[PDB]
């Protein structure tokens, strides 16, 4: 269950997930809706 | 104080490249004919476009540019065509031009590829190279294109659309018998294709009283001229430059008095 040497592929999967959801300009769109 | 007796020997011959070898000549002559395969071999190409209706995605000067770089069959009738600046006609005539015509309209919903199979000419000697198909533009339901073009004659110093050749390889002295180039570590360098060394050697031994001979060529072609008439038309074109300069010279030192 530990990730060893598959870390380089795994970390990019988690980074891809963040960008798919938050996006690059969620900074602007969330303070307006508030 | 006189010329040499060069000897040619062909190795390969296909419909798109020639490999040969020129022995017993000087380096300056073996290079001056390497620059003539590129620049000064005449060929046909489009040089005048007029658009009647263009509702595609690319603007007018995009399509007028992707047309000139289409290669036309220039095999035999390049010697019968005048230069449009020399011919005694008006702007255009069938003695110094060839007229093309394109007209496409998309009506079905599926997209349409406007290939080079649509360039329709009047002279059956000069057609685009189709005997796949170069793509010009794609159209959507409700768009169209129609134009008229003329195809002049020129060579590769005007514009890079008039040169008839892809890459032209050239090399001599495959092993540093002359040390024209100096390797710092001669062991890391791959052995040339034409070399005659052993598998465990790097360079031939240096010989000081040497001279470059036996040049190796490889001329490809884009599709206009056959790869063996690119060479014959180059030597016959370089000879006619010197032969014309000798006229102007003897005309000068004769009018010296």
């Amino acid at each position: 269950e530990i990730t060893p040497d598959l870390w380089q592929e795994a970390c990019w999967i988690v980074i891809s997930s963040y960008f798919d959801e938050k996006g690059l300009v969620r900074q602007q769109l969330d303070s307006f809706d508030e | 104080p006189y010329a040499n007796q060069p000897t040619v020997r062909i190795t390969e011959l296909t419909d798109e490249n020639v490999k040969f070898i020129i022995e017993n000549t000087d380096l300056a002559v073996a290079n001056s004919i390497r620059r003539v395969f590129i620049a000064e071999v005449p060929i046909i190409a489009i040089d005048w476009v007029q658009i009647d209706a263009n509702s595609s995605v690319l603007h007018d000067e995009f399509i007028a540019h992707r047309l000139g770089l289409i290669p036309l069959t220039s095999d035999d009738i390049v010697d019968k065509l005048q230069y449009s600046r020399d011919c005694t006609c008006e702007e255009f005539c069938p003695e110094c031009s060839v007229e093309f015509t394109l007209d496409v309209r998309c009506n079905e919903d599926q997209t349409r590829h406007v290939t080079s199979r649509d360039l329709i000419s009047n002279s059956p000697r000069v057609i685009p190279v189709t005997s796949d198909d170069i793509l010009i533009v794609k159209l959507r339901k409700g768009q169209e294109l129609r134009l008229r073009a003329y195809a002049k004659k020129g060579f590769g110093k005007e514009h890079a659309k008039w040169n008839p050749t892809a890459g032209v390889a050239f090399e001599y002295d495959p092993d540093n018998a002359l040390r024209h180039t100096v390797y710092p570590k001669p062991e890391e360098w791959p052995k040339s294709e034409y070399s005659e060394l052993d598998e465990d050697e790097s360079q031939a031994p240096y010989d000081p009283n040497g001279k470059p001979e036996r040049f190796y060529y490889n001329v490809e072609s884009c599709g206009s001229l056959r790869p063996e008439t690119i060479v014959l038309s180059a030597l016959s074109g370089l000879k006619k430059k010197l032969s014309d300069l000798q006229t102007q010279l003897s005309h000068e030192i004769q009018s010296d008095v």
Binding site: - | V57, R66, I70, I134, T165
Partner: protein, 64 residues
């Protein structure tokens, strides 16, 4: 936006090899083998197809 008709360095005709290139990657070929099945052997003519982005297929989505 659309495949150029000639390699910028050699001059070899490339503009007629884009649909055949997609057709070979369609079945199982690797990019290294599809480029060899087409006859592109200099690394200046392989850069042409290997690094091409086809923007014309996205401007055909806007109604004329």
């Amino acid at each position: 936006m659309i495949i150029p008709v000639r390699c910028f360095t050699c001059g070899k005709i490339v503009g007629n090899k884009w649909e055949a290139y997609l057709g070979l990657l369609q079945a199982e070929y690797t990019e290294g083998d599809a480029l060899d099945a087409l006859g592109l052997k200099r690394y200046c003519c392989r850069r042409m197809l290997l690094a091409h982005v086809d923007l014309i297929e996205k401007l055909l989505n806007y109604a004329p």
